[PDB]
Amino acid sequence: DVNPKAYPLADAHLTKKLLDLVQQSCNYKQLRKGANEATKTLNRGISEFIVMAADAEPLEIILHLPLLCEDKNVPYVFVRSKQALGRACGVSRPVIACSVTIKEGSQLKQQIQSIQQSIERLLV
Amino acid sequence: EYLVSPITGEKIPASKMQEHMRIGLLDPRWLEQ
């Protein structure tokens, strides 16, 4: 909508599920907020999927994240507002990028796998 | 764009929800000091 350079941009149906997963990972200490921490997780190879926002006006500050995901074969998806993503991540400040890491025997494995599947069929 | 206020459950403009959460939880005893 606002930004044509939005490839995996998701609609207002699975965005609710994405934010629910973000909150649950927050309760489980299972996310890294911020573009820099998402990039570090991608570099370490422990990132499972990262969600960013299409409201950051210089989107190219976070447009290296989909390229890094393509390099590491990591699902990636956008949202429609940075404020909602930030508030869902567990912080008041607007966040434009968050990552979800791994956990041994995680209770969120089924939902994170479902989210990975849902995003991967939305690229086209 | 409309969101839902977590505290009052009423439709709110998406642009204001940040300072809406900043100010709708304004601590009442702060007013006297």
């Binding site: 912080v91 | 969101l3 839902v4 505290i7 939880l25 009442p28």
Partner: peptide, 21 residues
């Protein structure tokens, strides 16, 4: 849709409710 306020304002709002009561 709604937004999920963070734990800091969770504690703040709980304190407001209890002090109010």
């Amino acid at each position: 849709l709604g937004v999920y306020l963070t734990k800091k304002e969770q504690k703040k709002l709980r304190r407001q409710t209890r002090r109010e009561a």
